[PDB]
Structure 1
Amino acid sequence: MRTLNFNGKISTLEPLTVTVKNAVSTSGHRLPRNGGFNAAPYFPGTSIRGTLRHAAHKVIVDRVGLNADGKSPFDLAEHFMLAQGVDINGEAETFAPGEINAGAELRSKNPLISLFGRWGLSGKVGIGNAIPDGDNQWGMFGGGARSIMFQRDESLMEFLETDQVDRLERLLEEQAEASVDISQIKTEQDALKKAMKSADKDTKAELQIKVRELDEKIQARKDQKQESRESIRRPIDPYEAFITGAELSHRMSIKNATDEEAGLFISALIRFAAEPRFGGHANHNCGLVEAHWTVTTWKPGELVPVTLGEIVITPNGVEITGDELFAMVKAFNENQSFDFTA
């Protein structure tokens, strides 16, 4: 068992963005911040870890074998336990505290669960956050605005029947009237939210009620729009993302990694390199990354770690250089004693 540290950089091919419920607020979309509003945003280790765990789950599904017409020989409980560590059945063998070698048999038979952990079983893999290199390297990408297709180019209107043209007329008049009414209501709402700043606690209750009621008024005003519930033409709030070519330092660790588990992890990185996507806004191709990792193992009691090799994920291929990385991959590919079932 070796402790492998993948220390390396994620270069950004297309902006790297993520919406975490914690970070974002009503002020707009913000990246998860390194402890403060005026801090360097980091790409969370949670998103990277989930992407790699799903890549490893697909690696396992491929490695066992797609039988039938592509259906994998795994139930839904197994897929959830392998990819998210949640047992829907509850039949997962909960290791009562104090159990010696907790899950050692499960770790030996399920290298994936050993790597990415479960409830009551520590995951050997720790996927750290990707911290950017240098000031800036983040920006408000996306954005823009929905425009009515038929108000932009008139040729598409030759493809619309008369009744559909009158439908568009009614839809736009409805959008305008709803916009004016909702905007007046929102002006009242933001004046009320300005009255928050005069924060007398006794008033705050009456203001939260008097603003959530005005937001229900907004919802009801939208609900009576026969043609379109939502205004079709509207500016898109931009999302904060790491710019293209941004260098994000990444640290990943596998504690006490067997050659089988480390080979599974390297195969997960290999399959991730096919679709090296991190985060969301994949409609704008956000998340495409090329990443290079230096694998260094550290024998405990030795003052220095030794370098096993380098994993380079690039659009031109995966360069896994190093005798020990290939040894790990071959050992994982050649071990037939993994039970991923219940």
Structure 2
Amino acid sequence: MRTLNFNGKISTLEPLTVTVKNAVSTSGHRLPRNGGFNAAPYFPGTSIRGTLRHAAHKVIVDRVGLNADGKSPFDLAEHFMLAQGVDINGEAETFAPGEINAGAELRSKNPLISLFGRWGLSGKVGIGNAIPDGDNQWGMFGGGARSIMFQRDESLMEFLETDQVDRLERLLEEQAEASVDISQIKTEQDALKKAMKSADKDTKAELQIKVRELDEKIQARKDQKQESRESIRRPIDPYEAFITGAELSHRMSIKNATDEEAGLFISALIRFAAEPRFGGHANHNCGLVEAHWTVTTWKPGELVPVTLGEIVITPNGVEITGDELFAMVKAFNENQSFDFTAR
């Protein structure tokens, strides 16, 4: 029942990216900025929390074990409760008085839920943001252009029958015509929006519905195309990610953690270390991390923390230091009195 602070650094073995709806705009995929528009970007603590929560959910699934066919005893509702904390049956009341003291037993018998709370139960684990140490440690990656296969390589043409080469010719001509159409209508739309800049507030709305008319006409010229819905050839807009080798300071807290809850958290860290993937862009191998955490504890009333040990996650292995971290992991592994099929 002590507070554990994992203070440490995440080194990015591959670029680390995330797409937050509010963070992104018409420009493209952009990391959250940690403040204003130009503030130094940070990796959401929400993405880290979700990744480690799903890692812990898989840990609990493996610990409970799988039947012969490979299925887990947990109900679908139980899976959602453990990993995302949404009561699909809708039997989770927010402030039902009678669960006031059932929280302690629920935490004791469900270490994952105590660690990662639910709607109405506070989560003991707070997974903070990862903020880069240095500056200019982010950049646009993933910039690309989907290209016709049979124009990059001609040896793929000898594999197509006559009717399929004719199909590719109709597709190419529909793409060129669609392109000329959507390009002239977007080249009138962009100057129309470059007139919306100097706009009378009322005229904002009229030029806006003009923009939406042009958008509807772009979507009907796309719904007109027979061969393809979307043009095969196109530039893929890059996404914003932390550079490779970026050092991001990270801070995670387990408030009043029992030995077994912290052990479950460390097991979650290990299982995430099996696949150290954060954020997204699993294509391009983005998200791979090498993170090291110094676990410090602080008995309330003491003037200094005590460093229990260090949790080093590297591609070469997971190193655990300190007898206390080993003790917590072993306590979690040896506690058979956990029940997750019942919230």
Using the alignment, how far apart are the partners of 2:79 and 2:187 within structure 1? 49
- Alignment RMSD, CA only? 1.2
TM-score by length of 1: 0.98
CA deviations over 1:193-217 (Å, ceiling 9, x no partner):
2122124221111122111111111
Using the alignment, how far apart are the partners of 2:38 and 2:58 within structure 1? 38
> 1:110: Cα distance to partner?
0.5
CA deviations over 1:260-298 (Å, ceiling 9, x no partner):
100000000000000000011111100000100000000
> 1:99: Cα distance to partner?
6.2
Q: Residue 211 of structure 1: SS of its match in structure 2?
A: helix
Q: Using a 3 Å threshold, how does the CA distance of structure 1 residues 199 and 109 change in structure 2: closer, same or farther?
A: farther
> 1:37: Cα distance to partner?
1.4
> 1:90: Cα distance to partner?
1.4
> 1:147: Cα distance to partner?
0.6
CA deviations over 1:71-95 (Å, ceiling 9, x no partner):
0001110000100010000123644
Using the alignment, how far apart are the partners of 1:47 and 1:250 within structure 2? 13
Using the alignment, how far apart are the partners of 1:95 and 1:191 within structure 2? 55
The aligned counterpart of 1:237 is: 237
The aligned counterpart of 2:145 is: 145
Using the alignment, how far apart are the partners of 2:273 and 2:99 within structure 1? 38
Q: Residue 123 of structure 1: SS of its match in structure 2?
A: coil
CA deviations over 1:13-42 (Å, ceiling 9, x no partner):
000000000111002221111111111110
> 1:100: Cα distance to partner?
4.5
Using the alignment, how far apart are the partners of 1:68 and 1:155 within structure 2? 47
Q: Residue 40 of structure 1: SS of its match in structure 2?
A: coil
Q: Using a 3 Å threshold, how does the CA distance of structure 1 residues 26 and 97 change in structure 2: closer, same or farther?
A: farther
CA deviations over 1:115-173 (Å, ceiling 9, x no partner):
01111110000000000111101010001101101000111111111111111111111
Check whether the contact 2:3–2:256 (CA below 8 A) recurs between aligned residues. Answer: yes
> After alignment, is 18-27 or 97-106 more displaced?
97-106
> After alignment, is 89-98 or 202-211 more displaced?
89-98
Check whether the contact 1:280–1:287 (CA below 8 A) recurs between aligned residues. Answer: yes
Check whether the contact 2:93–2:120 (CA below 8 A) recurs between aligned residues. Answer: no
Q: Residue 165 of structure 1: SS of its match in structure 2?
A: helix
Using the alignment, how far apart are the partners of 2:102 and 2:308 within structure 1? 29
Using the alignment, how far apart are the partners of 1:163 and 1:169 within structure 2? 10
> 1:112: Cα distance to partner?
0.4
Q: Residue 145 of structure 2: SS of its match in structure 1?
A: coil
Q: Residue 66 of structure 1: SS of its match in structure 2?
A: coil
Using the alignment, how far apart are the partners of 1:28 and 1:301 within structure 2? 49
* Length, aligned pairs only: 342
The aligned counterpart of 2:56 is: 56
CA deviations over 1:55-75 (Å, ceiling 9, x no partner):
000000000111131100011
Structure 1 residues not aligned, in runs of 5+: none
Check whether the contact 2:5–2:295 (CA below 8 A) recurs between aligned residues. Answer: yes
Check whether the contact 1:95–1:121 (CA below 8 A) recurs between aligned residues. Answer: no
Using the alignment, how far apart are the partners of 2:4 and 2:33 within structure 1? 28
Q: Using a 3 Å threshold, how does the CA distance of structure 1 residues 160 and 167 change in structure 2: closer, same or farther?
A: same
Check whether the contact 1:95–1:102 (CA below 8 A) recurs between aligned residues. Answer: no
Q: Using a 3 Å threshold, how does the CA distance of structure 1 residues 130 and 218 change in structure 2: closer, same or farther?
A: same
Using the alignment, how far apart are the partners of 2:200 and 2:217 within structure 1? 25
Pairs within 5 Å for 1:268-283: 268-283=268-283
Using the alignment, how far apart are the partners of 1:332 and 1:339 within structure 2? 13
Check whether the contact 1:3–1:256 (CA below 8 A) recurs between aligned residues. Answer: yes
Check whether the contact 1:312–1:319 (CA below 8 A) recurs between aligned residues. Answer: yes
> 1:244: Cα distance to partner?
0.5
